[PDB]
Amino acid sequence: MGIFGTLYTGVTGLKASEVQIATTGNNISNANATFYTRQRVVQTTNGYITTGGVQVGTGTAVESIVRLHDEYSYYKLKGASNQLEYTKYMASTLQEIAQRFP
Amino acid sequence: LSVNVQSIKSNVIDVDYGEAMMNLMQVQLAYQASLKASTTISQLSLLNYM
Amino acid sequence: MRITNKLNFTNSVNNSMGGQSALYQISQQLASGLKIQNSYEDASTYIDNT
Amino acid sequence: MRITNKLNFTNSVNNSMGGQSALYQISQQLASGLKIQNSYEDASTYIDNT
Amino acid sequence: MRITNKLNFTNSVNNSMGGQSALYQISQQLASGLKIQNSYEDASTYIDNT
Amino acid sequence: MRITNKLNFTNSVNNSMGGQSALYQISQQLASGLKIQNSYEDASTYIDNT
Amino acid sequence: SVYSEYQSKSGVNTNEELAALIQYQSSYGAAAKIVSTVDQMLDTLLGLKS
Amino acid sequence: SVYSEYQSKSGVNTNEELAALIQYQSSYGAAAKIVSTVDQMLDTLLGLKS
Amino acid sequence: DLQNTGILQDLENYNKAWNDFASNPNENATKIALVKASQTLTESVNNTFATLDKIQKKVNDDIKNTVDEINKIGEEIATINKQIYGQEALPTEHANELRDRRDELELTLSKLVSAVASKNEINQDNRLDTTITDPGHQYNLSIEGFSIVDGINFHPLKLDYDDKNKSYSIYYETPDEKVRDLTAKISGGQLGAQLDLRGRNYSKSEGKYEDGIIQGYMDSLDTFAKTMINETNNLYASSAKSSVTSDYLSGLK
């Protein structure tokens, strides 16, 4: 990167910190978002320089935010949530019945 | 019979103060932290303007 | 984000106001000593209560 | 630290409440001095009694 | 939120007074040892039993 | 050392995470009062006691 | 088991987040000092130009 | 209730006042720096023809 | 596993009734509750199997899920190399970093299993522009006893579960006057884990992926079920009936 080139690059790194900070603060706010997942961000770089051997690229730049987990683990436990409803409602039901003629 | 429903009726609406009190702590402690976290960001916002 | 940083000084309070509501929202439940006090906190319970 | 854990210590107080009542029934059993007090508690004790 | 701040604590105190008096009252009904103590409380009980 | 520097902070978290889990792991005994509470902890003692 | 399954791998918890922010603070501050240093280079450049 | 709903949004709330208080102070500062930055050009401008 | 985790106490519940029913041989109420409790106990066996069976199923599914997740990773990694290259040579500064994240992907193969590629000597300076940027010398890869993996691309490996019986099956094909299948001596940290546990060979004759660590456990589970199936059959067979007429069994001349 150039002189101005280095100037924004360090700025962008600071801006990325802000973005990283922004995500974390939200997650801090999400601490009681009782239906929230992990969304996290990525980084990248820009500019060119030359002496043989490889490809070249330099600087700082931000890259998108993503989430992924064992999706079906949610499916796994969701199946359980089903039958807990099945039993708990029945259990309460029988206690009602039992109270009728104690 | 009335006693049965009396308790049952309560139980439907009954709140456990200790459980809720702890849940208050859960949010109450958390809310404190997020408050400072907000402060930290606010300071971070200002200081860099050197 | 650029203008969002303007919104964010609000969002700090906005997120805070959520906890602000919650702590008191608990408090009336503490004061009421009941699971719920509004019709729309849990109607199914509420209809059952009625 | 966001799928398995933080909830369970919220449970423990809930579970503590589960024991909290369970103890109370036991206290009722001792206060009454009777094995069981409702249908689903021991069929044999019921069949034997009845 | 906002003038809620100004009175919510006041309201809590207002809430406390009612509960304090009510408990302080039942203390009186206990001190007297009667389900009621005055005409304006359950007149039929008060007048008829008088 | 150098690129440890940014990961070093993470180890401090990793160290912090261990204590978080560690204290929780103690909680199993605190709730249970037992040497262990799940099979993988020691198969034999469960096995034999069965 | 499923009850557990919302607070150790993926759905919201504190200690993970509170630590993570600290690195950004350090990285943020490091970047802040860095750019202010560049101003000095701009100055040197202008001076040589003169 | 009609109290509560004016209270819901009407007058003063710490974090609201605090947040804007900081923000304008920062705003007052950002302007001061740049305006002085404008001042430095007056010098450059004058120098152009001086 | 704890005292009263159903099955343990259920047998006692089963026998608690026999104490009373032995005490009162005419109390149908014991039979009624006992029959249900035992029936619930049978359900638990039905449930426990379905629990484990279903776990083994998803485990089996994980191969397809896994296979899918990594094949794209397979082509994605090989695709990354393409970008490194060109009809001419290039400058040293950044693909250095390009590799590394692509390198931890090779570590992901370690994670899964492992794979390796060659690194050796080349030049990357022109003076006449008659040049290239190239993978092979620095990347050509081997896996699990097979060794042909492309510098730049994924290659025709597949899994599909028939159409009639509709169960899994895996294949490969090749050009060099030779055409054989995918299944190498495959293993790995995850890749071996899935293969090792589920059932690894396939006896179409058995309709069974024969071995399995989980699969063997289910076989042992059934080894329990059938044995006790016979014994209470033996003991209930000891009971007296006015007729006996057999189950309907194959080949039974």
XYZ file of C-alpha atoms in Angstrom:
705
model
C 0.000 0.000 0.000
C 1.062 3.592 -0.639
C 1.536 6.365 1.887
C -2.119 7.233 1.796
C -2.208 3.508 1.117
C -0.786 2.663 4.538
C -2.926 5.411 6.036
C -6.333 3.882 5.369
C -5.032 0.346 5.873
C -4.211 1.056 9.506
C -7.514 2.921 9.700
C -9.348 -0.054 8.222
C -7.694 -2.315 10.781
C -9.050 0.020 13.441
C -12.406 0.001 11.644
C -12.328 -3.800 11.696
C -11.750 -3.624 15.449
C -14.898 -1.510 15.599
C -16.718 -4.162 13.575
C -15.313 -6.868 15.838
C -16.270 -4.694 18.801
C -19.713 -4.087 17.316
C -20.326 -7.818 16.951
C -19.173 -8.525 20.502
C -21.333 -5.783 22.000
C -24.357 -7.222 20.222
C -23.478 -10.698 21.472
C -23.232 -9.053 24.885
C -26.733 -7.753 24.231
C -27.643 -11.221 22.934
C -26.683 -12.742 26.300
C -30.440 -13.074 26.949
C -31.497 -13.425 23.303
C -32.732 -16.900 24.101
C -32.848 -17.921 20.454
C -29.517 -16.601 19.166
C -26.565 -18.111 17.304
C -22.850 -17.360 16.743
C -22.306 -14.886 13.890
C -18.636 -13.977 13.405
C -16.672 -11.992 10.840
C -13.598 -12.437 8.610
C -10.782 -10.319 7.124
C -8.823 -9.808 3.869
C -6.097 -7.735 2.155
C -5.488 -5.766 -1.044
C -2.320 -4.578 -2.782
C 0.682 -5.610 -4.850
C 4.519 -5.724 -4.716
C 7.124 -7.487 -6.903
C 10.003 -9.981 -6.789
C 9.557 -13.475 -8.311
C 8.125 -16.608 -6.738
C 4.488 -16.285 -5.628
C 1.438 -14.050 -6.006
C 1.289 -10.737 -4.119
C -1.360 -8.857 -2.179
C -1.301 -6.544 0.813
C -3.368 -4.425 3.186
C -6.449 -4.896 5.342
C -10.082 -5.491 4.452
C -13.140 -6.991 6.125
C -14.938 -10.180 5.117
C -18.479 -11.287 5.806
C -20.124 -12.683 8.941
C -21.305 -16.284 9.211
C -22.775 -18.961 11.478
C -22.977 -22.758 11.376
C -23.362 -25.537 13.922
C -24.760 -29.065 14.182
C -28.025 -27.959 12.622
C -29.668 -31.299 13.322
C -28.588 -31.235 16.971
C -31.388 -28.700 17.123
C -33.458 -31.285 15.259
C -32.281 -33.921 17.734
C -33.465 -31.944 20.748
C -36.556 -30.647 18.947
C -37.803 -34.220 18.691
C -37.368 -34.532 22.447
C -39.257 -31.284 23.059
C -42.186 -32.929 21.292
C -42.680 -35.848 23.659
C -41.950 -33.851 26.806
C -45.133 -32.009 25.897
C -46.714 -35.430 25.412
C -45.818 -36.692 28.882
C -46.014 -33.545 31.005
C -49.519 -32.749 29.787
C -50.544 -36.369 30.363
C -48.921 -36.466 33.798
C -50.762 -33.323 34.865
C -53.876 -34.859 33.321
C -53.714 -37.975 35.483
C -53.136 -35.991 38.672
C -56.314 -34.101 37.814
C -58.024 -37.472 37.403
C -56.606 -38.785 40.676
C -57.919 -35.760 42.569
C -61.467 -36.519 41.452
C -62.001 -39.399 43.852
C -59.140 -39.307 46.359
C -61.825 -30.971 47.342
C -61.732 -27.192 47.587
C -58.323 -27.452 49.250
C -57.105 -29.497 46.292
C -58.115 -26.907 43.705
C -57.030 -24.058 45.984
C -53.453 -25.321 45.932
C -53.714 -26.352 42.279
C -55.036 -22.920 41.342
C -52.142 -21.300 43.187
C -49.583 -23.664 41.671
C -50.725 -22.613 38.203
C -49.947 -18.996 39.070
C -47.413 -19.538 41.858
C -44.013 -17.884 41.403
C -40.900 -19.203 43.124
C -39.320 -16.065 44.540
C -35.922 -17.704 44.958
C -35.951 -19.039 41.403
C -37.131 -15.683 40.073
C -34.704 -13.848 42.350
C -31.833 -15.823 40.848
C -33.207 -15.200 37.368
C -33.168 -11.522 38.274
C -29.507 -11.985 39.201
C -28.984 -13.698 35.855
C -30.298 -10.677 33.975
C -29.319 -8.255 36.738
C -25.674 -9.312 36.725
C -25.715 -9.450 32.929
C -27.319 -6.027 32.625
C -24.539 -4.570 34.769
C -21.906 -6.058 32.474
C -23.562 -4.883 29.266
C -23.810 -1.447 30.872
C -20.067 -1.292 31.469
C -19.426 -2.888 28.081
C -21.399 0.015 26.650
C -19.288 2.393 28.735
C -16.070 0.740 27.564
C -17.159 1.298 23.972
C -18.052 4.910 24.737
C -14.588 5.525 26.165
C -13.043 3.656 23.242
C -15.019 5.965 20.977
C -13.575 9.116 22.548
C -9.951 8.269 23.278
C -8.842 7.579 19.699
C -9.560 11.178 18.660
C -6.013 12.110 19.681
C -20.863 1.016 10.797
C -20.593 4.633 9.726
C -23.941 6.263 10.524
C -24.900 3.238 12.625
C -22.312 4.529 15.075
C -24.774 7.364 15.538
C -27.524 4.799 16.013
C -25.192 2.786 18.225
C -24.994 5.401 20.966
C -28.751 4.915 20.971
C -28.424 1.149 20.587
C -26.385 1.177 23.782
C -29.377 2.711 25.547
C -31.776 0.709 23.379
C -30.218 -2.561 24.496
C -30.051 -1.133 28.015
C -33.718 -0.152 27.942
C -34.535 -3.798 27.267
C -32.929 -4.792 30.544
C -34.456 -1.720 32.162
C -37.903 -3.071 31.300
C -37.013 -6.602 32.390
C -35.788 -5.767 35.890
C -38.983 -3.915 36.721
C -41.069 -6.404 34.758
C -39.700 -8.837 37.321
C -40.364 -6.322 40.096
C -44.126 -6.271 39.574
C -43.993 -10.054 39.404
C -42.046 -9.834 42.666
C -44.534 -7.281 43.973
C -47.466 -9.314 42.672
C -45.784 -12.538 43.718
C -47.385 -14.191 40.691
C -46.129 -15.833 37.517
C -48.083 -13.330 35.412
C -50.149 -10.180 35.850
C -51.146 -9.250 32.267
C -53.627 -11.061 30.048
C -50.964 -11.361 27.333
C -48.103 -12.646 29.489
C -49.548 -16.127 29.007
C -53.164 -16.253 27.867
C -53.433 -20.049 27.965
C -52.567 -19.800 31.642
C -54.698 -16.658 31.830
C -57.797 -18.351 30.412
C -57.031 -21.285 32.692
C -56.671 -18.882 35.613
C -60.010 -17.229 34.882
C -20.108 -21.782 25.688
C -23.585 -21.422 24.189
C -25.414 -24.840 23.542
C -24.832 -27.312 26.424
C -23.850 -25.500 29.651
C -24.994 -22.116 31.025
C -28.620 -23.219 31.382
C -28.003 -26.161 33.691
C -26.950 -24.109 36.711
C -30.197 -22.287 36.062
C -31.675 -25.784 36.341
C -29.924 -26.577 39.611
C -32.038 -23.998 41.421
C -35.033 -25.380 39.534
C -33.860 -28.850 40.503
C -33.253 -27.540 44.010
C -36.915 -26.561 43.959
C -37.787 -30.059 42.772
C -36.059 -31.462 45.824
C -37.545 -28.580 47.806
C -41.060 -29.889 47.203
C -40.005 -33.547 47.192
C -38.725 -33.006 50.718
C -42.105 -31.486 51.565
C -44.049 -34.563 50.467
C -41.647 -36.641 52.541
C -42.394 -34.298 55.433
C -46.098 -34.892 54.813
C -45.464 -38.639 54.797
C -43.658 -38.348 58.129
C -46.218 -35.910 59.520
C -48.973 -38.277 58.385
C -46.974 -41.421 59.078
C -48.521 -43.037 55.993
C -46.707 -44.587 53.040
C -48.709 -42.925 50.275
C -51.486 -40.376 49.897
C -52.658 -40.528 46.254
C -53.490 -43.120 43.631
C -50.339 -43.354 41.541
C -48.001 -43.805 44.497
C -48.112 -47.557 45.067
C -50.634 -49.883 43.446
C -49.732 -52.770 45.754
C -50.211 -50.587 48.824
C -53.544 -49.671 47.242
C -54.526 -53.197 46.185
C -53.252 -54.496 49.520
C -55.184 -51.813 51.378
C -58.363 -51.725 49.288
C -38.859 4.377 31.044
C -38.160 8.010 31.596
C -40.495 9.564 34.161
C -41.109 5.975 35.153
C -37.708 6.578 36.713
C -39.082 9.527 38.664
C -41.977 7.629 40.226
C -41.234 3.912 39.865
C -39.160 4.071 43.033
C -41.896 6.294 44.438
C -44.422 3.739 43.208
C -42.467 0.973 44.914
C -42.746 2.975 48.135
C -46.423 3.497 47.365
C -46.657 -0.239 46.773
C -44.819 -0.863 50.037
C -47.182 1.322 52.059
C -50.238 -0.636 50.947
C -48.586 -3.950 51.722
C -47.103 -2.639 54.960
C -50.489 -1.399 56.149
C -52.231 -4.600 55.059
C -49.713 -6.737 56.931
C -49.777 -4.212 59.768
C -53.554 -4.535 59.633
C -53.619 -8.333 59.819
C -51.307 -7.812 62.771
C -54.190 -5.847 64.265
C -56.749 -8.532 63.429
C -54.332 -10.964 65.055
C -53.839 -8.658 68.038
C -57.623 -8.461 68.317
C -58.014 -12.099 67.298
C -61.101 -11.451 65.168
C -61.725 -12.116 61.490
C -62.756 -8.444 61.261
C -62.623 -5.448 63.587
C -64.936 -2.707 62.257
C -68.317 -2.174 60.632
C -66.863 -0.937 57.334
C -64.990 -4.233 56.922
C -67.827 -6.765 56.729
C -70.961 -4.994 57.911
C -73.258 -8.022 57.871
C -70.782 -9.919 60.025
C -70.258 -6.883 62.247
C -73.904 -5.888 62.658
C -75.517 -9.322 62.608
C -73.097 -10.855 65.095
C -73.345 -7.740 67.256
C 6.821 -14.647 22.059
C 5.296 -12.863 19.145
C 2.388 -14.520 17.335
C 1.668 -16.192 20.644
C 0.815 -12.612 21.603
C -2.569 -12.585 19.880
C -3.211 -16.264 20.618
C -1.853 -15.761 24.148
C -4.928 -13.736 25.022
C -6.915 -16.722 23.776
C -5.094 -19.103 26.105
C -5.975 -16.804 28.987
C -9.540 -17.364 27.833
C -8.808 -21.070 27.465
C -7.443 -20.973 31.000
C -10.544 -19.047 32.061
C -12.772 -21.530 30.233
C -11.195 -24.403 32.154
C -12.075 -22.891 35.513
C -15.597 -22.172 34.296
C -15.954 -25.840 33.375
C -13.983 -26.891 36.457
C -16.279 -25.083 38.881
C -19.277 -26.506 37.035
C -17.793 -29.995 37.236
C -17.588 -29.517 41.001
C -21.251 -28.496 40.931
C -22.239 -32.051 40.000
C -21.000 -33.129 43.426
C -22.585 -30.041 44.982
C -25.999 -30.997 43.617
C -25.474 -34.747 43.966
C -23.113 -35.042 46.912
C -21.665 -38.089 45.150
C -18.134 -38.888 44.016
C -19.349 -38.852 40.406
C -22.664 -38.527 38.594
C -22.235 -39.951 35.063
C -20.932 -43.229 33.699
C -17.876 -42.058 31.722
C -16.460 -40.674 34.981
C -15.771 -44.163 36.360
C -17.574 -47.169 34.901
C -16.522 -49.561 37.664
C -17.953 -47.768 40.689
C -21.335 -47.451 39.005
C -21.071 -51.025 37.726
C -20.156 -52.509 41.091
C -22.754 -50.531 43.025
C -25.472 -51.711 40.644
C -29.887 -33.446 28.280
C -31.752 -31.384 25.689
C -32.418 -28.755 28.354
C -28.649 -28.368 28.610
C -28.310 -28.023 24.879
C -28.658 -24.235 24.627
C -25.685 -22.806 26.623
C -22.087 -24.439 25.949
C -21.555 -24.790 22.153
C -23.735 -22.273 20.168
C -26.575 -20.308 21.933
C -25.532 -17.153 23.932
C -23.216 -17.079 26.979
C -21.138 -14.490 28.829
C -17.589 -15.519 29.682
C -16.780 -16.306 26.057
C -17.868 -12.844 24.925
C -16.485 -10.668 27.721
C -12.939 -11.892 27.116
C -13.094 -11.673 23.316
C -13.786 -7.939 23.454
C -10.538 -7.308 25.330
C -8.377 -8.311 22.366
C -10.261 -5.904 20.114
C -9.672 -3.178 22.697
C -5.948 -3.911 22.577
C -5.955 -4.261 18.795
C -8.120 -1.146 18.557
C -5.754 0.831 20.765
C -2.705 -0.483 18.931
C -4.236 0.653 15.646
C -5.033 4.048 17.175
C -1.417 4.689 18.172
C -0.313 3.328 14.797
C -2.230 5.803 12.652
C -1.282 8.777 14.824
C 2.309 7.751 14.119
C 1.587 8.012 10.387
C 0.740 11.664 10.906
C 4.384 12.160 11.810
C 5.435 10.607 8.527
C 3.042 12.877 6.689
C 4.763 15.704 8.500
C 8.237 14.552 7.510
C 7.072 14.262 3.935
C 5.662 17.774 3.881
C 8.847 19.094 5.418
C 11.093 17.502 2.814
C 8.749 18.770 0.118
C 9.141 22.287 1.423
C -52.029 2.602 34.267
C -52.525 5.935 32.522
C -49.651 7.081 34.697
C -47.548 4.136 33.567
C -48.006 4.883 29.875
C -46.836 8.493 30.211
C -44.048 7.120 32.315
C -43.289 4.715 29.487
C -41.883 7.678 27.586
C -41.883 11.240 28.846
C -39.114 12.667 31.012
C -35.450 11.962 31.831
C -33.602 8.622 31.924
C -29.985 8.342 33.022
C -28.465 6.367 30.158
C -30.391 8.453 27.632
C -29.077 11.708 29.090
C -25.626 10.212 29.622
C -25.357 8.836 26.086
C -26.245 12.083 24.318
C -24.143 14.011 26.834
C -21.093 12.021 25.741
C -22.024 12.112 22.066
C -22.241 15.882 21.682
C -19.072 16.312 23.734
C -17.407 14.041 21.202
C -19.213 15.973 18.466
C -18.038 19.272 19.953
C -14.543 17.783 19.886
C -14.584 16.370 16.346
C -15.625 19.799 15.090
C -12.931 21.582 17.100
C -10.148 19.417 15.675
C -11.272 19.797 12.061
C -11.963 23.525 12.391
C -8.420 23.956 13.659
C -7.503 21.783 10.687
C -9.249 24.373 8.525
C -7.231 27.011 10.359
C -4.008 25.281 9.343
C -5.036 25.712 5.710
C -5.553 29.423 6.170
C -1.846 29.342 6.830
C -1.170 27.196 3.796
C -3.506 29.346 1.740
C -1.743 32.494 2.800
C 1.593 30.838 2.208
C 0.556 30.045 -1.342
C 0.702 33.743 -2.172
C 2.560 35.158 0.820
C -27.644 -44.942 34.781
C -29.032 -44.550 38.279
C -31.209 -46.554 40.616
C -34.749 -46.642 39.191
C -33.587 -45.739 35.666
C -36.629 -47.721 34.589
C -35.365 -51.082 33.346
C -33.628 -52.032 36.593
C -36.629 -51.212 38.773
C -39.043 -52.405 36.082
C -37.873 -55.981 36.577
C -38.356 -55.417 40.297
C -41.730 -53.824 39.579
C -42.325 -56.903 37.454
C -41.367 -59.075 40.417
C -42.945 -56.871 43.082
C -46.260 -57.901 41.535
C -45.312 -61.587 41.570
C -44.843 -61.243 45.324
C -48.399 -59.941 45.702
C -49.807 -62.104 42.918
C -48.055 -65.024 44.581
C -49.608 -63.693 47.788
C -52.975 -63.356 46.003
C -53.093 -65.633 42.944
C -56.598 -64.416 42.032
C -56.085 -60.633 42.120
C -56.426 -59.684 38.455
C -55.504 -56.111 39.387
C -51.896 -57.234 39.801
C -52.048 -58.880 36.376
C -53.563 -55.724 34.902
C -50.934 -53.403 36.364
C -48.155 -55.977 35.956
C -49.044 -56.654 32.321
C -48.953 -52.926 31.610
C -45.733 -52.307 33.546
C -43.991 -55.155 31.739
C -45.500 -53.860 28.504
C -43.975 -50.490 29.346
C -40.713 -52.309 30.028
C -40.935 -53.850 26.560
C -41.545 -50.363 25.173
C -38.365 -49.186 26.880
C -36.537 -51.938 25.006
C -38.333 -50.780 21.874
C -37.441 -47.192 22.760
C -33.834 -47.955 23.679
C -33.303 -49.742 20.377
C -34.905 -46.888 18.457
C -32.715 -44.494 20.426
C -29.524 -46.372 19.562
C -30.752 -47.432 16.122
C -31.531 -43.818 15.295
C -28.153 -42.681 16.628
C -26.430 -45.281 14.463
C -28.624 -44.087 11.595
C -27.521 -40.466 11.871
C -23.997 -41.824 12.270
C -24.495 -43.616 8.970
C -25.999 -40.413 7.616
C -22.919 -38.540 8.803
C -20.917 -40.349 6.117
C -23.179 -38.915 3.439
C -23.343 -35.622 5.319
C -19.592 -35.820 5.827
C -18.826 -36.971 2.284
C -20.867 -34.061 0.959
C -19.324 -31.481 3.284
C -15.791 -32.524 2.367
C -16.180 -33.134 -1.367
C -16.945 -29.444 -1.838
C -13.978 -28.881 0.452
C -12.178 -31.322 -1.817
C -12.867 -29.260 -4.924
C -12.599 -25.949 -3.071
C -9.043 -26.754 -1.980
C -7.970 -27.919 -5.434
C -9.683 -24.850 -6.885
C -7.598 -22.592 -4.632
C -4.423 -23.851 -6.288
C -5.739 -22.777 -9.695
C -5.693 -19.187 -8.455
C -2.020 -19.495 -7.512
C -1.027 -20.134 -11.086
C -0.924 -18.727 -14.588
C 0.567 -19.022 -18.044
C 3.555 -17.099 -16.585
C 5.508 -16.680 -13.338
C 4.586 -14.341 -10.443
C 5.899 -12.245 -7.449
C 6.785 -13.746 -3.996
C 4.877 -11.683 -1.373
C 1.255 -12.995 -0.802
C 0.278 -16.483 -2.018
C 2.501 -17.282 0.937
C -0.555 -16.336 2.996
C -2.945 -17.801 0.410
C -1.433 -21.207 1.114
C -1.771 -21.032 4.873
C -5.558 -20.895 5.076
C -5.551 -23.353 2.216
C -2.897 -25.136 4.276
C -5.068 -25.516 7.371
C -7.500 -27.098 4.929
C -4.834 -29.733 4.334
C -4.779 -29.874 8.125
C -8.538 -30.459 7.931
C -7.632 -33.557 5.942
C -5.364 -34.435 8.851
C -8.309 -33.658 11.122
C -10.377 -36.037 9.002
C -7.501 -38.364 8.148
C -4.353 -37.165 6.356
C -2.899 -36.369 2.944
C 0.436 -35.162 1.606
C 1.910 -33.477 -1.463
C 5.407 -32.931 -2.837
C 7.566 -29.832 -2.411
C 10.707 -29.349 -4.478
C 12.788 -26.935 -6.545
C 11.536 -24.518 -9.229
C 12.344 -21.025 -10.561
C 9.930 -18.105 -10.933
C 11.784 -15.435 -12.941
C 11.252 -14.629 -16.604
C 13.843 -12.691 -18.662
C 11.806 -13.819 -21.699
C 8.249 -14.228 -20.310
C 8.191 -17.807 -21.626
C 7.168 -19.101 -18.209
C 4.458 -20.691 -16.046
C 3.207 -20.738 -12.459
C 2.628 -24.343 -11.426
C 1.137 -26.704 -8.750
C 2.565 -30.136 -9.271
C 6.187 -29.949 -8.144
C 4.838 -28.188 -5.040
C 1.462 -29.949 -4.846
C 0.332 -33.359 -5.979
C -1.406 -35.392 -3.360
C -1.970 -38.936 -2.101
C -4.617 -40.433 0.194
C -5.267 -43.615 2.165
C -3.310 -45.980 -0.082
C -4.530 -44.436 -3.326
C -2.221 -41.817 -4.781
C -3.703 -39.782 -7.586
C -4.979 -36.336 -6.583
C -5.125 -33.382 -8.939
C -3.150 -30.173 -8.636
C -6.221 -28.071 -9.310
C -9.416 -30.151 -9.326
C -11.656 -32.654 -7.588
C -12.183 -36.027 -9.244
C -15.048 -38.481 -9.809
C -15.663 -40.099 -6.420
C -19.214 -40.917 -5.367
C -21.643 -42.655 -2.999
C -25.240 -43.607 -3.765
C -27.769 -45.940 -2.195
C -29.290 -48.009 -5.024
C -32.905 -47.662 -6.201
C -34.742 -50.870 -5.223
C -33.334 -52.103 -1.940
C -32.007 -48.561 -1.829
C -28.977 -48.847 0.460
C -25.547 -47.195 0.206
C -22.864 -47.919 -2.395
C -19.568 -46.269 -3.415
C -17.605 -46.100 -6.685
C -14.663 -44.699 -8.666
C -13.457 -44.774 -12.286
C -10.171 -43.975 -14.031
C -8.735 -43.656 -17.578
C -5.434 -45.554 -17.773
C -6.653 -48.826 -19.310
C -7.881 -49.386 -15.742
C -11.239 -48.791 -14.039
C -11.762 -49.777 -10.397
C -13.510 -48.278 -7.342
C -13.202 -45.656 -4.580
C -12.756 -47.671 -1.407
C -9.093 -47.502 -0.427
C -7.745 -48.510 3.005
C -9.631 -45.406 4.098
C -9.479 -44.318 7.751
C -8.856 -41.126 9.719
C -9.521 -39.089 12.820
C -13.099 -38.441 11.784
C -13.095 -40.475 8.584
C -11.944 -43.609 10.378
C -14.224 -42.797 13.302
C -17.345 -42.893 11.142
C -16.167 -45.925 9.175
C -14.980 -47.798 12.256
C -18.142 -47.304 14.293
C -20.963 -47.685 11.777
C -20.113 -50.898 9.989
C -17.348 -50.931 7.474
C -17.543 -53.764 4.940
C -20.899 -54.554 3.308
C -22.384 -58.040 3.203
C -25.152 -57.485 0.688
C -25.788 -61.145 1.508
C -26.397 -60.165 5.128
C -27.839 -56.876 3.913
C -25.376 -55.791 6.564
C -22.432 -53.448 6.801
C -20.807 -56.196 8.738
C -18.672 -54.999 11.573
C -19.347 -51.604 13.125
C -18.517 -50.725 16.702
C -22.000 -49.288 17.146
C -23.417 -52.033 14.926
C -21.737 -54.720 16.995
C -23.212 -53.097 20.088
C -26.700 -53.353 18.586
C -25.962 -56.983 17.764
C -24.970 -57.495 21.396
C -28.116 -55.620 22.422
C -30.189 -58.102 20.430
C -27.996 -60.883 21.811
C -29.569 -59.878 25.116
C -33.099 -59.470 23.783
C -33.474 -62.886 22.169
C -31.959 -64.853 25.046
C -34.346 -63.531 27.684
C -37.048 -63.745 25.025
C -36.587 -67.510 25.161
C -36.373 -67.892 28.921
C -39.632 -66.216 29.886
C -40.953 -68.077 26.863
C -39.608 -71.176 28.603
C -41.187 -70.198 31.908
C -44.463 -68.954 30.461
C -44.388 -72.058 28.281
C -44.408 -73.842 31.639
C -47.907 -72.432 32.122
C -50.834 -74.669 31.193
C -53.024 -74.121 28.129
C -55.745 -76.165 26.453
C -53.947 -75.893 23.100
C -50.484 -75.303 21.683
C -49.932 -74.371 18.051
C -46.544 -73.315 16.795
C -45.175 -70.150 15.307
C -44.861 -70.395 11.530
C -41.233 -71.008 10.630
C -39.360 -71.299 7.352
C -38.023 -74.447 5.725
C -39.714 -76.367 8.528
C -40.287 -79.749 6.936
